[PDB]
Each structure stands twice: as structure tokens, then as C-alpha cells.
Amino acid sequence: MLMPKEDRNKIHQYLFQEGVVVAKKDFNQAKHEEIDTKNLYVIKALQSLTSKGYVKTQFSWQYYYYTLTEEGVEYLREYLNLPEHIVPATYIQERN
Template identity: 45%
Template structure:
């Protein structure tokens, strides 16, 4: 399928940015990505099938959708094709900053929340240890079996 270079570059840029892409099997629909909404799903599918045949992406098909994941060879290829430096990596491969955990209560030291959590855990453990009201005589094979004739097939 013949495509303009600007369209191919747009697809490659979106793929490199996130390292994953999807497209619905409805071929005449427009692609839902904001930067690719001028393209149909057919164009996106054909470009990414071409990358799959060269071994740059892995393809997964579920229901009416295609899903593609960029592998390491594909990252290197797109870096060279789009003229990007080696420091630029897809967003799925970037390290996230760990969020700062805040306590749920208004105190600054957070001891009140820890005491509450400890109390909840203690209550659960004492519940599990307390077996006076529970009997072990339930379940399959616990009761006596009684066979009575006259039920089901074969009664004469």
C-alpha cells in the first residue's frame, strides 16, 4: 500500500513515543489517537504489519483489535529512522518517580495511622486463631453416607 512519508512518520512517532499501539479491525474508521485521526485504521494496520514482518514489533490479536508492542530492535530502527538521540526512550521504558506517601490522618508523624493499621491486623489474626465456634465437620466427606434405593434410573 502506498502511503505518504508524512503519514508513515506520524505513525512511527506515535509508536516510538509509547512503544505500544492498537487499531480496531474496522478498516474504514479513523484511528482514535489525536495525532493520527486523519488516518484510517487500515493505513495504521498495514504500516505496523510491515514492521511486524521485519521483526520490529510483536502482534497480538484479540476480538476486533490488533495490539502491537515495540521490541528492542524496533526501538533502534525507529531511533535511526526518526533521527532521535540514544537518550530518548519510549514512555513505557522510562523510570517513574515514586510518589510520596502521605498518612491519612492530620498528624505529621504518622504514628496514629500505623497504630490503627496494627490494630486492624491484630483483630484479623485473633479472628483467624479463634476456632471455638467453628467445626471441622463440614465439607465433602465429613458426614455419613446414606444410600437409599428407588431414586433415579433403573427402578423396577
């Protein structure tokens, strides 16, 4: 798609941080809850990210559920550059 690196990272980064993204099917949503971009931006960004492995997508009642997968856990490691032994949804909280 056509979107500036700024918005790509605000996605990409947030994906690595949370390890998870949800987002309602409604392009033209201006700003999406949480991430600071066009909703349309998120959906397609991820769609790409999935179509090359990396991430998994689920629908049901009008909402996308993107699950970051293990090979992606590497790809983001390249795109965000951060060193191996980084992070994801891969902590166990304090003692929760």
C-alpha cells in the same frame, strides 16, 4: 503499502512515543482514536514493521495489540533519527 511520509511519521513517531499501539480491525475507519491517520494506514504500517522483526502483534476479540520490541527500538531510532539514550515505554514515571 501506499501512504505519504506524513502519515508514516504520525504512526512511526507515535509508536516510539507510546511504545505501544492498539487498533480495532475495521479498515475504512477514516480517523483512528488517537493517531491522526486512516485506521487502515496504522494496521498495515505496523504489519510491515512487524514482518521485519522490530515489533510484535497480538489479536483476540477483533483488536490488534502491537508491542514495540528491542530491535525496533533501534529502527525507530534511525527513522526518527533521534539520538541513542532517547525513550519509549522506558521510563518509570516520577515515583509511580
